[PDB]
């Protein structure tokens, strides 16, 4: 189980989702502005995409 996609930093949401869904077809993908405060709960189904103001991936996407 691959759980992180560092190679997607700087990519658009559209591009990132295409790669993630190949690896984890039933992923629950949520998009949030980078810096958003989140809780510590671990959700194995989820992959949060933290984006910058240009709508590009700003932090390494990971399961959780």
| CATH number assigned to the domain comprising residue 15 | 3.30.10.10
Q: Determined by which method?
A: X-ray
Q: Which domain holds residue 55?
A: 1-64
Strands 46-51 and 28-33: what pairing? parallel
CB-neighbour burial class of residue 46 (10 A; exposed 0-12, middle 13-18, buried 19+): middle
Which residue is it, tokens 């700087």?
A: 10
Task: Give the number of domains in the chain.
Answer: 1
Q: Breaks in the chain at C–N > 2.5 Å: after which residues?
A: none
Report how far residue 44's alpha carbon sits from residue 12's, in angstroms, rounded to the nearest whole number.
23
**Displacement of CA 36 from its chain's centroid (Å):** 13
In angstroms, what is the resolution?
1.7
Report how far residue 59's alpha carbon sits from residue 45's, in angstroms, rounded to the nearest whole number.
19
Q: Where are the beta strands (DSSP E) in 6-56?
A: 28-33, 46-51
């Amino acid at each position: 189980m691959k759980t992180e996609w560092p190679e997607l930093v700087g990519k658009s949401v559209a591009a990132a989702k295409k790669v993630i869904l190949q690896d984890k077809p039933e992923a629950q993908i949520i998009v949030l502005p980078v810096g958003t405060i989140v809780t510590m709960e671990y959700r194995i189904d989820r992959v949060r995409l933290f984006v910058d103001k240009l709508d590009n991936i700003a932090q390494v996407p990971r399961v959780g």
